[PDB]
């Protein structure tokens, strides 16, 4: 499934690292959905999603307030990593609007699997953003 990142580098204090907090927050809201949803109807995943999407708005903001300060040269990979998370959310939505459009159908259970898929992507990528930015602080230091 190839490519993998070793654990977040230990060489950086995480006490006031709001990126690490927000990523952890976003991954956590995905896990909430990804692990509840199987059961519940549209009156329960639609927010479960809005939640994930709020937790992302935050992370993206915090990353905005964080890029200025890093090396100018590493601003592009981080801006890209961010847009990727945007489309990841877009997929999640498309597959939600679909699970809705087809309730109490054989197709409802399917667009749900597609949601879980899209939300997993989101989290994996939220973790890759953090990975990039860390390399960006490492650079700025050494």
């Amino acid at each position: 499934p190839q490519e993998i990142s070793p654990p977040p580098t230990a060489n950086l204090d995480r006490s006031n690292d709001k990126v690490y907090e927000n990523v952890t927050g976003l991954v956590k809201a995905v896990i909430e959905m990804s692990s509840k949803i199987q059961p519940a109807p549209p009156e329960e995943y639609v927010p479960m999603v809005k939640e994930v999407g709020l937790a992302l708005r935050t992370l993206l903001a915090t990353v905005d307030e964080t890029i200025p300060l890093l090396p100018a040269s590493t601003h592009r990979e981080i801006e890209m990593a961010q847009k990727l998370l945007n489309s990841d959310l877009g997929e999640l939505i498309n597959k939600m609007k679909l699970a809705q459009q087809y309730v109490m159908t054989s197709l409802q259970q399917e667009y749900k699997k597609q949601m879980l898929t899209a939300a997993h992507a989101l989290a994996v990528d939220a973790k890759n953003l953090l990975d990039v930015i860390d390399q960006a602080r490492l650079k700025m230091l050494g």
Partner: peptide, 12 residues
């Protein structure tokens, strides 16, 4: 971000 917000709006 306006686009992320346009998505968020759809959820409300």
């Amino acid at each position: 971000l306006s686009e992320l917000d346009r998505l968020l709006l759809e959820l409300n």
